[PDB]
């Protein structure tokens, strides 16, 4: 009866796989088979931005590589000085279940979001003294996994509704909705030029999104379990998936397929957060068994371990300058490394 | 020393913020956070209503504040979230005493399997479930005054032969007590199967009009605190 549609869909998939197969003329190990390894990476917590009560999910640097916002499950956005340990601001959140946080690239705003399905826009550099909300973005029907600022005007949220969204702050309403995924989306990453982005979901398949009209540009499908974190490679022509099946993987958009998987037998905990540094020769992967790992993204062998956290690592972000990595973690301690 | 006049005033501001944070910690440490799970068949709304009387359109999570003996409980009834739960459940690894609710008179194996999953989940270990078996009275009329038998959906209910009950409420006919204890025992077995010592599972036979549910959590709940203290005071 209706099975023609399902059969031809599965055939479109069976041809997509072979189209992808006909492209890998060499593996990313092979092109980096001849390259110099990175060595061993040792990093020490220069600062330790302690002061959060409960665990930490969210941590975004300000775009000055100095300011740091962190979201905690007691409901605090604490904006740190991160050269001193000074606490620039402390915002009392409403829904203490924040999962993400942001920092507008100007720096004038932070958006926290959370499990209340609402992306809140707190305003720092008001002509007045204290921080207070600018808008509240309520159109998602499921918790927010991530949120990123396009600018002072546009914010992109990833929700548990299998949907990513685009917002206009003053109009406080969606401009576009991205609706391809099948499991709930867990992490979002704007492109380096903010023209497009990629969303890693709980379908074991992240998808690139072109935020001008709202069409899923392409769809990579390689992970065994659901994907916990995404982060664009700084050139914009790749990105990193750290999934709950204890693997990191690197996809690149133009070759449209998996390139290299960062794996090792001992890891049975999944990923929670990934990030490249500045040059993309180093992929920091945050893990779940209480300590991060540092991955030579090209040659894929582990190179450098961070282990200073009692509890699991939940957020991890390099600076735009590349001279620090904060690692918030469920032990409620941020840690700046170098 | 090596820092300017503004750096001094800035460390002053940061210390002021530390002071506010420690006031908040004084507030936040002395409060108890309960995640309230359960299914749409469960009396999940009725437990919340009862303890609310004891004390926003697409909101992801609701919450009721309530206190029992000068102790502030903060119970989060998860709201308009999706059917899957394996990712937002991790946000309650630090709560005290997940309340779990099932419908005794019921399709119950789904609740059984879900609580079995809650028991074994990483980050959900070290959290001691509290069981509230609702529709206890509805189970009374479903067993003593009804047709459908628990023998199917549960073959090993004919060969059960109830253990020596301490003192069931005397209004209960023995068949009712036997089945009622059967349900509790199925839940407890999978509670004791994998969670060695640090989980506890606290069963309870709760109803729509059982006004002791607030206290029933205080007690149990107070006893979870005591287990945590025994361990983290090196006293255990």
């Amino acid at each position, epitope marked *: 009866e209706l099975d023609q549609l399902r059969q031809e869909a599965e055939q479109l998939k069976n041809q997509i796989r072979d189209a992808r197969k006909a492209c890998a003329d060499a593996t990313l190990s092979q092109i980096t088979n001849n390259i110099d390894p990175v060595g061993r990476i040792q990093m020490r917590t220069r600062r330790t931005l302690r002061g959060h009560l409960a665990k930490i999910y969210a941590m975004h640097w300000g775009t000055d590589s100095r300011l740091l916002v962190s979201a905690s499950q007691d409901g605090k956005l604490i904006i740190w000085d991160s050269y001193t340990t000074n606490k620039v601001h402390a915002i009392p959140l409403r829904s203490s279940w924040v999962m993400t946080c942001a920092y507008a690239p100007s720096g004038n705003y932070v958006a926290c979001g959370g499990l209340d399905n609402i992306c809140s826009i707190y305003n720092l550099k008001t002509r007045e*003294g*204290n921080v207070r909300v600018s808008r509240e973005l309520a159109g998602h029907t499921g918790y927010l996994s991530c949120c990123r600022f396009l600018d002072d005007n546009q914010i992109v949220t990833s929700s548990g509704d299998t949907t990513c969204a685009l917002w206009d702050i003053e109009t406080g309403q969606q401009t576009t909705t991205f609706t391809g995924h099948t499991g709930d989306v867990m992490s979002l990453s704007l492109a380096p030029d903010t023209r497009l982005f990629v969303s890693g979901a709980c379908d074991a398949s992240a998808k690139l999104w072109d935020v001008r009209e709202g069409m899923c540009r392409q769809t990579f499908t390689g992970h065994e379990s659901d994907i916990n974190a995404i982060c664009f490679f700084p050139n914009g022509n790749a990105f990193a998936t750290g999934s709950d099946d204890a693997t990191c993987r690197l996809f690149d958009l133009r070759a449209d397929q998996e390139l290299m998987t960062y794996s090792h037998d001992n890891i049975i905990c999944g990923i929670t957060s990934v990030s490249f540094s500045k040059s993309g020769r180093l992929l920091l992967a945050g893990y779940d068994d209480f300590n991060c790992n540092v991955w030579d993204a090209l040659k894929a062998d582990r190179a450098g371990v961070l282990a200073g956290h009692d509890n699991r690592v939940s957020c991890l972000g390099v600076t735009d300058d590349g001279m620090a990595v904060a690692t918030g973690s469920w032990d409620s301690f941020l840690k700046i490394w170098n | 020393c090596t*820092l*300017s*006049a*503004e750096d*001094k005033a*800035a460390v*002053e501001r940061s210390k002021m913020i530390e002071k506010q944070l420690q006031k908040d910690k004084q507030v936040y440490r002395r409060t108890l956070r309960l995640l309230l799970l359960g299914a749409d068949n469960s009396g999940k709304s009725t437990i919340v209503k009862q303890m609310r009387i004891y004390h926003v359109k697409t909101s992801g999570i609701f919450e009721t504040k309530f206190q029992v003996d000068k102790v502030n409980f903060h119970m989060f009834d998860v709201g308009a979230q999706r059917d899957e739960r394996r990712k937002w459940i991790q946000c309650f690894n630090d709560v005290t005493a997940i309340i779990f609710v099932v419908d005794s008179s019921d399709r119950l194996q789904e609740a059984l399997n879900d609580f079995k999953s809650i028991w074994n989940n990483r980050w959900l270990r070290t959290i001691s479930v509290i069981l509230f078996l609702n529709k206890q009275d509805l189970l009374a009329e479903k067993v003593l005054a009804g047709k459908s038998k628990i023998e199917d959906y549960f073959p090993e209910f004919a060969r059960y032969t109830t253990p020596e009950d301490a003192t069931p409420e005397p209004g209960e006919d023995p068949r009712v007590t036997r089945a009622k204890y059967f349900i509790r025992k199925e839940f407890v077995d999978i509670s004791t199967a994998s969670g060695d010592g640090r989980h506890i599972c606290y069963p309870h036979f709760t109803c729509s009009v059982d006004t002791e549910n607030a206290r029933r959590i205080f007690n149990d709940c107070k006893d979870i605190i005591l287990q945590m203290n025994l361990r983290e005071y090196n006293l255990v």
Partner: single-chain antibody
Amino acid sequence: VQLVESGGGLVQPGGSRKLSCSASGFAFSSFGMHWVRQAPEKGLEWVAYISSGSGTIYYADTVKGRFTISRDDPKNTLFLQMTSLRSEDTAMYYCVRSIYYYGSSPFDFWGQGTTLTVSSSSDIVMTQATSSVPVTPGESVSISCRSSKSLLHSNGNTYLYWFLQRPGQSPQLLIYRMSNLASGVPDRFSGSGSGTAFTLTISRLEAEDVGVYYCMQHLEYPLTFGAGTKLEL
């Protein structure tokens, strides 16, 4: 942000005066809070200070232990006393805030400060250039000022602020820490420095760009000022 004080008037050289403040427009219990005075036909002076949540209370070297800058957050006022005022500190007062976090801009907004009248030191000084420089619109003024001490701390930033004055309303910040513009200021004002000898570059001199370009440094606590170069139309 309206800063209105009280008191002020005829003051005897031995009469106790209560120069209270009042400020009901901003997050008062968050801000550092100085005081500044201008000798009538002269430059303007640093006076008592109080930080956010009073913990650091520096002072001048003419008031130091004299009349006690105080605070009352729930009423949002800077209470003051004073009694003697040796007939030469007589001037018109002001009320200034300054928030001190990383990236904050201090001295962003100043008040009016009633003008009580009398019935009769290894600090720094802001050395200035020729004070008149009368210029008509369209030219690039580069009025300057020099510091006794080298204003470049190990932080990496040069500590110099920059103000006007008008025939009338209060003074106002142009740039803070010598490079960065204020909030309600046109981009034509600018700042170029070296550490010890430095200036601001103006481009368009409109009818409201007329005034006196004072100066102040925030590296120690004399909180020094200059004589004030008075630009004419």
